[PDB]
Design a protein around this ligand. Sequence first.
Ligand SMILES: *[C@@H]1O[C@H](CO)[C@@H](O[C@@H]2O[C@H](CO)[C@@H](O)[C@H](O)[C@H]2NC(C)=O)[C@H](O)[C@H]1NC(C)=O
Ligand SMILES: *[C@@H]1O[C@H](CO)[C@@H](O[C@@H]2O[C@H](CO)[C@@H](O)[C@H](O)[C@H]2NC(C)=O)[C@H](O)[C@H]1NC(C)=O
Ligand SMILES: *[C@@H]1O[C@H](CO)[C@@H](O)[C@H](O)[C@H]1NC(C)=O
Length: 592
Amino acid sequence: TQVCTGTDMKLRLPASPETHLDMLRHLYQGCQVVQGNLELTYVPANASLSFLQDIQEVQGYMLIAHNQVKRVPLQRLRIVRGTQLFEDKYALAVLDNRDPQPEGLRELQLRSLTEILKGGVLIRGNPQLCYQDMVLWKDVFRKNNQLAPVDIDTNRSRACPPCAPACKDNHCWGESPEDCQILTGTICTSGCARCKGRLPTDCCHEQCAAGCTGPKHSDCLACLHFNHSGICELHCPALVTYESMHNPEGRYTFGASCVTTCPYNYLSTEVGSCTLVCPPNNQEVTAEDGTQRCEKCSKPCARVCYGLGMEHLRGARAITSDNVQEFDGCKKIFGSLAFLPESFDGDPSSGIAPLRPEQLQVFETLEEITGYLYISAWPDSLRDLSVFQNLRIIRGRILHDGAYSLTLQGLGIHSLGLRSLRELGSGLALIHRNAHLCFVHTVPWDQLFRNPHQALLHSGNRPEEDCGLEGLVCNSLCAHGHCWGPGPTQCVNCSHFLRGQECVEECRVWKGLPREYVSDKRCLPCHPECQPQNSSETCFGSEADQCAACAHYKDSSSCVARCPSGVKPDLSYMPIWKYPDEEGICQPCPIN
Ligand SMILES: *[C@@H]1O[C@H](CO)[C@@H](O[C@@H]2O[C@H](CO)[C@@H](O)[C@H](O)[C@H]2NC(C)=O)[C@H](O)[C@H]1NC(C)=O
Ligand SMILES: *[C@@H]1O[C@H](CO)[C@@H](O[C@@H]2O[C@H](CO)[C@@H](O)[C@H](O)[C@H]2NC(C)=O)[C@H](O)[C@H]1NC(C)=O
Ligand SMILES: *[C@@H]1O[C@H](CO)[C@@H](O)[C@H](O)[C@H]1NC(C)=O
């Protein structure tokens, strides 16, 4: 697309360096607006970072830390809004880009960045870096962001070449005549916050953010608040106008844009904003057909199951013996599930018992997670993720490290067993360091994804061709070779009939055990009082009334194990007394 979602990993090491770059690539390739924080970290010496080259806007902060690359190609980046700040104060943080000694970041080259709405700048520990002190920062910082901290270290093990002669003022982002700083704040006339030149004819509209092509609200380089189809405006048009009526111009706010409709995986509020999370004392209602909306509860909200990151589990790290039981009977969890080594080791200092595999069945009910699933430890006695057999959707409205809606890491599992998983609402799946794990590639991951930024990243599992030579392959009854584990329960779809959750070639219509009838490709058992037929069907439905014939006795039209002796109909005093015919037909007893 063009709008994408950033991350939230701060300075923490990537779990998967073998995969980190792929991740950055899948998140940012083609992306123009990052909603969230743009965090580029631990990029090695030779990485290609060219998938960053379309980024024109960061809504949160931008963090460039712990890389060895010499160049970070962000020359189209126009604005960092700073709706979130690093260390709660910096819109731009460039940290520790060096090697343990020549490598390390050399120039920032942010030659399009003409706007920082909120927060300041931190540049520290970057020993090859030049030109960090030749930016006029206060031109960059919005007029009312002028007191933003500038904490810019210039300790260097190299000599900086000057700003190229062609630079009209002595300001630049780098040594080349292309990296000249373009000034759009400090050079303006009067009460003009942003301009394209020194004259008032060059003033930008007040609703523009980084600069302009001309004077109009259709000529902005970026919108200060909201882009309403090519016009920057203070507000999106209301959904309702005042008698009060519906407004056919109505728009929803999504980021710095006015949208006709909320994007996938988002909820609509009455006031027409889009959220990942409802305001307090709301409920999520699924319009019958796809939509979800936030609606305030007139009386007390129905009791709901909160997972990690949410309400009283806001600060909780992991599912544990002290908390598993809060999930009994839960179909929907608002929040996330994470199972870490601590979950299964316990902690003898708090007295926390290790989580027993049996306790995990409290999840057999689970159909939906609004946040993420993160599994970093799992019992060795559980060969698969079968306790989540009925899990249908991981929404990924909250994501681990702000990137992953499904993580399985360093586990001993042999198969997945996630047999109901049909949807990863957003975020990436990361499945790595599971040395005995097969049936990863038998899953049709493209079918669970919902945007083109999502992918499965994988490494260190069992090679697929090594599984495929040991008979760990999809059962042959699974349609299209798609399955989640070995055997006939693990199909994504059955090509034939299902008996319970087992895929079978045939129902027991003529042959078999207890006899069966068919209904919607489903093997269903005849009543136990039906007599199995040697030649024909044994039943045509489930009830005692629906047998070819009775194994024991018959009462009116249904096959029965015993004749009624003294059975009283609901609201009657008169009991029925019967006895079986010589041919097994229940007849009325001659006495009451
Ligand atoms: C990144 O680039 C450099 C430069 O090509 C790599 O260093 C080279 O290593 C190869 C392989 O042995 C040598 O043949 C070159 O002569 C080296 N060049 C240098 C720096 O003098 C470096 O290994 C690369 N780093 C990564 C992350 O692979
Ligand atoms: C505001 O958003 C509009 C989208 O409505 C952007 O304008 C479109 O940009 C695409 C790709 O850049 C063009 O192909 C279309 O011709 C444009 N359409 C419209 C509605 O003008 C626009 O760039 C954004 N403006 C700002 C200031 O960010
Ligand atoms: C950079 O140099 C000065 C003076 O030599 C020193 O006091 C300062 O602490 C250094 N910066 C860092 C990385 O601490």
